[PDB]
Design a protein around this ligand. Structure first.
Ligand SMILES: OC[C@H]1O[C@@](CO)(O[C@H]2O[C@H](CO)[C@@H](O)[C@H](O)[C@H]2O)[C@@H](O)[C@@H]1O
Ligand SMILES: OC[C@H]1O[C@@](CO)(O[C@H]2O[C@H](CO)[C@@H](O)[C@H](O)[C@H]2O)[C@@H](O)[C@@H]1O
Ligand SMILES: OC[C@H]1O[C@@](CO)(O[C@H]2O[C@H](CO)[C@@H](O)[C@H](O)[C@H]2O)[C@@H](O)[C@@H]1O
Ligand SMILES: OC[C@H]1O[C@@](CO)(O[C@H]2O[C@H](CO)[C@@H](O)[C@H](O)[C@H]2O)[C@@H](O)[C@@H]1O
Lengths: 391, 245, 391, 245
């Protein structure tokens, strides 16, 4: 492949070079400090509810004509999604580096809630920048973040959106980084954030490795996870990556399909570009302007994807595919009715890919889907669709 | 070579405009108005869909330019329209990395031929290792464009070396008092003009900045004025009141 | 004490005597059948997420000037409340007794959702009777139960309320009991349901006993739990009841306080009576007509209470108190802001009682509150209150 | 003694009314209307706030009576108002357990003195153990009220003994064909009249029931009629069309 840069990097304006260099240097020491690792372990067990179970879903498997199917239940984590693994890790990192404050930005509020949750439990001042248009659209999550003690800054500058909150948050960090940690929600961003987020989500596959060996005595044949920015998938994949007998499938938001142009499938039609400080696959036009995206699920509705997945896409190590809104909606209802597990629309994309390949898999195969979160938050939107019964 | 010439005069005014904000014709008209108003160096913004390093005013300006269909091709039209008016005033292309990363070496040559003299890439820092090279800064040097780099007080000596490797024309400086001496050590280290990168919008601060800086930049005021009253006469007038003397 | 009957009993019309006798006889065999106990254990671990953690809440303790404080995290159970322990037990019981169908009734829908969840995972036909007026008030939970595959029967007979759904559900069971199990949500009802529900919630205190010995080496000094019908409290109390050094506190919904008459505090002003097939403390007037109740939290808004708590109230073994709506609301915000744990308004009554006694407890004491469920479901109502900040 | 007398005549009609539905006066008027219409035994409902064993029609009737302030005291007024009209017609108090459990032995005596002859408690089954006694059924016997009990085909022999212990007056029977023989074995076991408890609302089914039952009960029709047109003349008329012959 022809690339001027390795995937990742730190394509940053000058004012962020010192903060990013400090973090990187500090992180290299911290990730092997046993007291930090031990304390994070204790918090994940006694506060967040790790380890999450691995649920065999025999009714679902039967209904889709599939093989042996297991769900890694990150929906049972405190706050109902895997994002808290990373929020607690980074906010504990902040505390250990002496920061008293954590700053983030948020679009739908899912990352804002996780960060605010970790900051409340750890006793850190938490500040979340949010475009005013998103504040108006997400008053429930705004109220939740405020109840969790976060300061939610409604950004009314510029065009009052995610773009303007990102600018406000980074401007804050450039001023306050000596005492403020900047908490990034996904496996995106300038180095060292892709390494940091991956490190804190790897616990998922460490657990799966123990749990699947306990029930089946061997590694799975297939791992399927959805891909918004890449954090739950890279942590779910991590400890199986060196096993060539384990297939790795990442499923992106396919929206209305590739032909319509309304999707979030970076690997279907995107190509490498530099955006938000890192180099990775990107939905962009001929001039390199970033394209508008669409997905029924707001957690997948991004034009970017983490550089570790870009590496595995071009290396051929992992298969990146997509599911349309309607495949995701159908899988949602299938899992809810057959197992009583209400999955997030994000994870429903992973489920949907399994639904469409299940009849071709030999029945002895073992498939684990990463149930990255619960879908109670998606019920008002799904109820508005007024769907009939799916089979 | 053209930037180096203009800094033989002292205390220059750099004026920012977003290419394509208001369309091709308007951008050319606004550039003429700033030149007639006394601006010594035009900083022409390649609008980017995600300019996280710019203040909201400039973010919304970029949004307008791209909704009016600024492309890598009409940017060449704009630069050629400016050079059909004035072939002395240096032109700095200010840009994010990706719109240039997605072009090729030939597009850089086409920029130079159209009239661009320097390129400032706000999110492409000089390489950190003394060995590691920068494909894009090399590409700029190969075609005769001046890479316009930005340094801070906390610039690591590792940069200082490689920043000195690729810097041409002049250096932007983003300071924190005795800042005059602060600029002299930088200026003598690089033997290039050092320009305070802070946004100037009134005559009093521009005169203040020029005590120690080789120029000042008006980043916001001109763009903001096109949103108050877009008639370009008011841009000439605004320049004349901001530039000292 | 002067009583014509022991607490509990089976005060049933003739048509329910045979169904209730069959269940009782069947249950006596089943509760000691190792294969049934083992399978229920496996389901609670791999599907529901047991065992739930025990979280020390040091910020909360500090903010209320309290001693060592721990939360038993039934909010982290699948579906977000302890009710699933009992739903899975009873629906597994149904399956083992050969029933193919489960019937319930529901008011707010919390029990309907738990039953529907257990029936979907176990593959049982599930039928939930709901008064039409409640259907209209609870369209989100109605949609959830239908997505979980339950048939939600909207009862438009009579006055279209809980009372009419109860009548419809019992009429159904009297007709269908040879193949339908009737799933009761709380430690109420004719024998043997108080024993059955208590048996399936006792896992809570079995876990607490292990967990509190692991962190502290001794039994707690105080257990506090809220009391709607009594099921989470009796299971949380159960394995500590024989220890006289463990105080047992049950906290009822105090509404607007006793003087206003708008509350659900059976033990404050009620007295024994026969209602829904059992004898226990009851909010009733001079003629024995059941009184209207009020609580900010619909899970506590009942005129009845389980007979096992009636026994412990008169024996002096446990202290039954109350918390007003506003004490519950304040405790809610205190826990959310200081620990990032969003408790149900039900459990917030337990929290509130701790808030009001905390400064008098010696700092070495160990208090465990049972966090019977998460409070995401209560956010729309709490946001409507438009409260300011609590301290 | 008064119930036993009335069953010397054969094929009796029992009519249900909710005490206090429409108020004290109305309840007395409706009872007069049913007696004039040929009803042989009045079944007077003590309305309960939570009558889970009654069909919705009767549930809403109980709601109305309690919203019109039926109390354990105005129930005595109602019974005394009926007995000021007719002192021959047996009166069955039909009730849930709790409104009577919350009263005392003296209230039972006051009921007997007012005119009540039997008490049917729908959610108080006869005790299961052959030894265990029933405080309330004992209390009924002690004051001379007839406990009116309900049996099913699946009644365990353990009940049969204790049901026979406390049953007086007549027994209600709730059957599943050759039901005639089915009733005879029950009737001969208890040597009491056995009445089919099913709700009769037309003459054809009442005549059908009386082939094997010693009476039939009109549970819903009268109550429902007070909601169509409450003028009590229509209750007399309705009785006359439902009772055969
Ligand atoms: O626009 C915010 C801007 O101000 C700074 C300080 O100059 O932070 C202040 O404002 C924040 C937003 O409310 C507060 O959270 C913070 O406590 C306060 O100091 C910058 O950090 C930021 O860019
Ligand atoms: O602008 C075209 C450019 O966009 C990409 C994504 O980087 O694909 C987009 O445009 C295609 C043409 O409409 C669509 O089919 C596709 O769905 C959409 O995302 C590139 O493939 C293309 O060069
Ligand atoms: O009113 C319901 C009534 O009908 C019965 C059968 O006679 O059950 C039927 O109706 C239920 C309500 O929809 C269905 O769930 C059931 O499958 C159907 O048989 C009785 O059980 C019930 O009392
Ligand atoms: O009807 C009075 C009766 O009700 C009880 C509850 O069983 O108490 C209720 O009435 C009281 C008088 O208003 C209130 O103070 C109380 O809050 C309310 O629940 C009995 O105490 C009383 O006998």
């Amino acid at each position: 492949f022809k690339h001027k840069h390795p995937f990742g990097g730190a394509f940053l304006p000058e004012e962020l070079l010192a903060p990013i260099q400090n973090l990187k240097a500090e992180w290299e020491i911290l990730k092997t400090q046993q007291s930090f690792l031990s304390e994070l372990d204790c918090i994940l067990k006694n506060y967040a509810g790790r380890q999450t179970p691995l649920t065999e879903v025999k009714n679902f498997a039967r209904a889709i004509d599939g093989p042996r199917v297991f769900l890694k239940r990150e929906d049972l984590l405190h706050t109902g999604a895997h994002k808290l693994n990373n929020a607690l890790g980074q906010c504990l990192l902040a505390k250990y580096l002496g920061k008293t404050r954590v700053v983030a930005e948020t679009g739908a509020g899912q990352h804002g809630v996780a960060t605010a949750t970790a900051c409340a439990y750890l006793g850190l001042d938490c500040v979340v920048y949010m475009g005013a248009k998103d504040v108006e659209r997400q008053k429930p999550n705004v109220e939740k973040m405020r109840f969790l003690g976060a300061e939610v800054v409604s950004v009314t500058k510029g065009s009052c959106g995610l773009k303007d909150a990102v600018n406000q948050a980074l401007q804050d960090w450039a001023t306050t980084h000596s005492f403020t940690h900047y908490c990034l929600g996904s496996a995106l961003g300038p180095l060292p954030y892709p390494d940091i987020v991956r490190f804190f989500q790897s616990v998922i596959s460490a657990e799966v490795k123990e749990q699947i060996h306990a029930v089946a005595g061997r590694d799975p044949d297939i791992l399927i996870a959805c891909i918004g920015g890449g954090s739950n998938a890279i942590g779910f994949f991590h400890h199986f990556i060196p096993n060539p007998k384990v297939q790795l499938i990442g499923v992106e938001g396919g929206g209305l399909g590739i032909s319509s142009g309304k999707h979030a499938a970076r690997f279907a039609t995107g190509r490498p570009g530099v955006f938000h400080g890192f180099y990775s696959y990107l939905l962009q036009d001929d001039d390199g302007q970033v394209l508008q995206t669409h997905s029924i699920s707001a957690g997948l509705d991004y034009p970017s994807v983490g550089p570790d997945h870009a590496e595995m896409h071009e290396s051929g190590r992992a298969f990146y595919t997509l599911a349309t809104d309607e495949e995701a909606l159908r899988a949602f209802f299938l899992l809810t009715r057959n197992e009583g597990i209400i999955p997030a629309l994000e994870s429903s994309h992973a489920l949907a890919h399994l639904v469409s390949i299940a009849p071709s898999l030999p029945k002895e195969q073992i498939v684990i889907v990463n149930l990255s979160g619960r879908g109670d938050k998606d019920l008002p939107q799904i109820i508005r669709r007024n769907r009939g019964i799916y089979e | 070579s053209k930037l180096t010439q203009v800094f033989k005069q002292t205390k220059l005014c750099i004026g920012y405009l977003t290419a394509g904000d208001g369309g091709t014709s308007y951008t050319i008209e606004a550039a003429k108005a700033l030149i007639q108003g006394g601006v010594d160096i035009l900083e022409l913004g390649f609008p980017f869909s995600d300019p996280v390093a710019d203040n909201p005013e400039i973010q919304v300006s970029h949004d307008r330019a791209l909704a009016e269909n600024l492309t890598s091709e009409t940017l060449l039209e704009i630069v050629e329209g400016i050079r059909a008016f004035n072939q002395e005033v240096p032109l700095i292309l200010y840009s994010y990395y990706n719109p240039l990363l997605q072009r090729d070496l030939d597009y850089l040559r086409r920029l130079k031929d159209a009239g661009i003299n320097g390129v400032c890439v706000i999110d492409l820092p000089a390489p950190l290792s003394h060995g590691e090279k920068s494909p894009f800064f090399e590409d700029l040097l190969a075609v005769g464009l001046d890479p316009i780099l930005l340094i801070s007080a906390g610039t690591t000596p590792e940069r200082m070396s490689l920043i000195q490797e690729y810097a041409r024309g002049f250096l932007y400086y983003i300071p924190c008092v005795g800042i005059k001496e602060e600029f002299r050590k930088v200026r003598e280290h690089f033997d290039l003009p050092i320009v305070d990168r802070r946004d100037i919008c009134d005559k009093k601060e521009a005169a203040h900045v020029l005590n120690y800086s080789d120029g000042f930049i008006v980043k916001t005021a001109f763009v903001h004025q096109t949103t108050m009253d877009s008639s370009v006469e008011t841009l000439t007038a605004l320049a004349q009141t901001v530039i000292p003397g």
